[PDB]
């Protein structure tokens, strides 16, 4: 999560700030990654 | 609002009283700020614990001392014979070759800059004795430094023995010299009624004067001190100096001794000064049982060393739990020295059996029957002490056994260091080359050397 | 020099395989079909 700050444009910096993720130490792995960590639930509506 | 003479934490400031919270108890405390705001509020019940109130100077100087030769001591073919007839004993032809070699350097007007690893044998002051009788052959004085007062005592003893019917005035000045006699000797070498001065740090500290500072005998200078080397340099206003520093500086100047200092060591240890059976190992108490069984089979004496802060005594009690047979003491120092000599005569009387010593300084005698030695913390040590222990164990023709105990194998530089300790049999220049390897590992400029040497000539 | 390339003979990669195999102290019977052990160095570093 200690990511390189990107400044290709102000929008790049802003979107990089507003980016959220589901991985990390304590996140998940790509190995057992199914589709539940990939599809969009109906509760994402207006939420993500 | 008051200052304090506080005993156990330095400067104190009484700043009133503090009724503070023990968890349920309002004990009273004192507002005390100390050195760097030591904000202690001690319980007031402890009232009696409180009362109300760089080197480039010497570099260019010794560079000029290189650039200025000085006086020669011509060979004086009666003075060195006068002492030389008095030695009723053989000298090593290696050491004799080095003797007349450095005597020839005395005949040079240049500053005599010699090191010799003449350690143990047929009188190792003997080269210094005949060089000194050349030096006082022109009446010049012989400074003689030392690591310790006991070696100073022993060497001034041998000088007296050499100069019973020879008027070469030797005199000891250190901690144990009586004070009236201390300034008597100070005045006498200041008057030239003393020719040889003897002693440790006090000689560098006591204000000395030289009628003719011809000789300056330094010896095993690594433990004497590198700042003590600089104090020697302060006492070295362009004079001619002797160095029996067989155990040298750890290459902060020893590689610089290559090139300018004359590396004139002797080799070929006596075949009969045979090695001790070295056993580098981990620790196991049964091997200890076997070794002390061998030593009681020969009835000999045992060396085991302890250098850790941990209780020498409860360690000894553990040993006696293992080994109730022998009689072990504790020669941790910070003791009255009556206990020290009483332990010495107890291992002379020998009912005491295992010398639990704790320093090679505390192992500063080679008891003959001590034909084993047990070391567990040699990783946390230095090599001069190591083969001084090796040179302090075992009388000749008694095949002693060295046991070295290191379960941790996790200190790779010190690991190969102990490897290059235990490979060496005896004094066949492994003194020299082992020190070479060690200080290669220890520290690890000719450009600025000869550069500023030139401008020193310009001075 | 302006010519075609020469043609490489026994592979030097395969040579270093033989070398490490003998470093594991094993025999390799590298041969022709008629059992000649063709020392690929032809006596460069073999006694």
């Amino acid at each position: 999560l200690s990511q390189f700050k990107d400044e290709t444009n102000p929008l790049s910096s802003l979107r990089h700030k507003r980016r959220i993720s589901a991985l990390g130490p304590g996140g998940l792995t790509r190995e057992r990654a199914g589709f539940d960590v990939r599809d969009v639930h109906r509760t994402h509506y207006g939420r993500i | 609002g008051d200052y304090l003479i506080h005993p156990e934490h330095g400067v104190g400031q009484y700043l009133g009283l503090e009724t503070r919270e023990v968890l349920g108890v309002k004990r009273d405390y004192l507002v005390l700020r100390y050195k760097g705001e030591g904000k202690l509020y001690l319980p007031v019940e402890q009232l009696p614990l409180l009362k109300r109130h760089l080197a480039g100077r010497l570099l260019v100087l010794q560079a000029k001392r290189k650039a200025t030769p000085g006086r020669a001591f011509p060979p004086l073919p009666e003075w060195d014979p006068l002492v030389e007839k008095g030695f009723p004993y053989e000298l090593t032809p290696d050491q004799k070759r080095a003797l007349e070699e450095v005597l020839r350097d005395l005949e040079s007007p240049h500053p005599m800059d010699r090191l010799v690893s003449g350690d143990v044998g047929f009188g190792k002051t003997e080269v210094a004795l005949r060089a000194a009788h050349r030096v006082v052959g022109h009446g010049a004085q012989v400074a003689f430094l030392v690591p310790t007062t006991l070696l100073a005592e022993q060497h001034g003893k041998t000088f007296r023995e050499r100069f019973q019917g020879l008027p070469v005035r030797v005199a000891v000045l250190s901690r144990f010299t009586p004070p009236k006699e201390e300034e008597a000797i100070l005045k006498g070498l200041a008057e030239g009624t003393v020719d040889i001065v003897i002693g440790t740090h006090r000689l560098l500290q006591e204000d000395v004067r030289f009628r003719d500072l011809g000789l300056l005998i330094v010896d095993e200078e690594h433990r004497f001190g590198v700042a003590q080397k600089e104090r020697i340099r302060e006492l070295k206003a362009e004079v001619d100096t002797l160095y029996l520093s067989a155990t040298p500086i750890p290459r902060t100047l020893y590689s610089a001794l290559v090139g300018l200092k004359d590396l004139s060591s002797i080799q070929t240890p006596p075949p009969g000064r045979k090695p001790i059976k070295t056993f580098l190992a981990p620790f196991d108490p049964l091997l200890v049982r076997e070794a002390i069984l061998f030593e009681l089979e020969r009835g000999g004496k045992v060396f085991y060393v302890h250098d850790r802060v941990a209780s020498i005594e409860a360690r000894r009690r553990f040993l006696e739990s293992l080994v109730p047979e022998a009689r072990i003491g504790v020669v941790h120092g910070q003791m009255p020295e009556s206990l020290i000599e009483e332990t010495m005569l107890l291992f002379a009387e020998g009912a005491y059996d295992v010398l639990l010593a704790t320093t090679i300084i505390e192992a500063g005698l080679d008891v003959p029957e001590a034909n084993t030695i047990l070391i567990e913390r040699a990783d946390r040590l230095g090599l001069a002490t190591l083969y001084q222990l090796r040179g302090r164990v075992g009388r000749r023709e008694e095949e002693a056994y060295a046991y070295l105990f290191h379960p941790p194998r996790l200190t790779e530089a010190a690991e190969k260091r102990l490897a290059a300790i235990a490979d060496l049999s005896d004094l066949g220049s492994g003194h020299l080359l082992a020190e070479r390897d060690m200080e290669i590992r220890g520290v690890g400029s000719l450009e600025v050397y000869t550069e500023l040497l030139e401008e020193a000539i310009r001075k | 020099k302006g010519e075609d390339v020469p043609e490489p003979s026994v592979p030097e990669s395969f040579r270093v395989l033989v070398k490490e195999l003998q470093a594991l102290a094993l025999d390799v019977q590298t041969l022709d079909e008629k059992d000649n052990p063709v020392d690929i160095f032809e006596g460069l570093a073999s006694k």
Binding site: - | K277, E412 | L17, E20
Partner: protein
Amino acid sequence: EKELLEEMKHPSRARRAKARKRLEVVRAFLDSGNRPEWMILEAVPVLPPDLRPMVQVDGGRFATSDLNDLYRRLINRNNRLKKLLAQGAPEIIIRNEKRMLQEAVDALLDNGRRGAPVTNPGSDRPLRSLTDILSGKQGRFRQNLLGKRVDYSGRSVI
């Protein structure tokens, strides 16, 4: 091998299979003509130094081939055992040192199969074994024979 065949005649199919496996081994050694006494090692080889290149970088540091320092450890082991046998030492130290020399061979061949990987002290990534030079992706097969870089090449966009 006759009594292994007798076990093959014995109805115990499990011991039939075990004796069958050992029979495969001994039959392979028989037709191979190898001497099974050669599985005990005495004549340790020497790697040529181009194959173990300790070449130096600019800043003093090297291409530190881990087997070279392993070789140094083995030399110290061998000479320690040599001088220990050269003095008539007590046997426990002799046994311990022989055991340690065996560990030295074991870690040199492949570190960390028996016990932990002894790394360089002051480090925790291991000492890359000769098997590691052989086995693995960076090992000889996959690395040095299947994928490489190339000279006389180019790259641009289309």
